[PDB]
């Protein structure tokens, strides 16, 4: 579903992805209501979306 309204990838993808844990930086005891996403859109996803 993150790859449904926001970003999936190009189908013939070249290059790659690097990810790592970020609990220390992008988290607070009070909560971060700053990173938000999309739940509703009319149509289906296709590669570039912003």
């Amino acid at each position, epitope marked *: 579903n993150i790859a449904d309204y926001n970003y999936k990838l190009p189908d013939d993808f070249t290059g790659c992805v690097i990810a790592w844990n970020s*609990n220390k930086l992008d988290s607070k*005891v*009070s*909560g971060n209501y700053n990173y938000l996403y999309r739940l509703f859109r009319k149509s289906n996803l296709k590669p570039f979306e912003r």
Partner: antibody
Amino acid sequence: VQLVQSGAEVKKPGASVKVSCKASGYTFSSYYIHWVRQAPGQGPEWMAIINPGDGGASYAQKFQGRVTLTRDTSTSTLYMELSSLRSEDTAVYYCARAEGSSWLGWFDPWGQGTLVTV
Amino acid sequence: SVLTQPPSASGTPGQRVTISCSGSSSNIGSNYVYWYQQLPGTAPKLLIYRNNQRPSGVPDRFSGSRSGTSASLAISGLRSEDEADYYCAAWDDGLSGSGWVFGGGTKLT
């Protein structure tokens, strides 16, 4: 520059028990507050971490939702209202101090604790 | 995870023994450890930071170190006053909960 607890006694199981300790000393808005529970004859379990000011709260897996905490700045009181007491909920509570704006690091000295039994 | 600890730590006055906490992956090898000593009848007191320096000041007869997924504390010059219970605390970061987990329980004799 110290924290002292409040007095309590044995209560009926399946009820609400009010627990509190004061806070005084340095500035208040930039020091996180830890509470931790310790059972006799065993190891202590971490209870909660609280940000003053906005009163941010976070709870562990074994106590998520079944315990309620409140906090304030001017009166400087720190309340929990325990509910659903078992024989497992007979232990001593401690209120602490942290580094400040960070929940990782060494723990500043605790109080004298509050003993609760059912 | 669970932070297994030996049930007791044998000792005699005037010698050196090591007390250790053995943990799982991403609990000891990831974050630092904290050693604690509980004197009877008193509130617990901090004794070490991350095991490279002393917090305020203690004689250097106690030495802490890490090895892989475990942490160890070597104590020497044992006295009858220091007979207490030792605990270790660490940030767990496990599945469904990431609290400040503690060890088991040991007794110094």
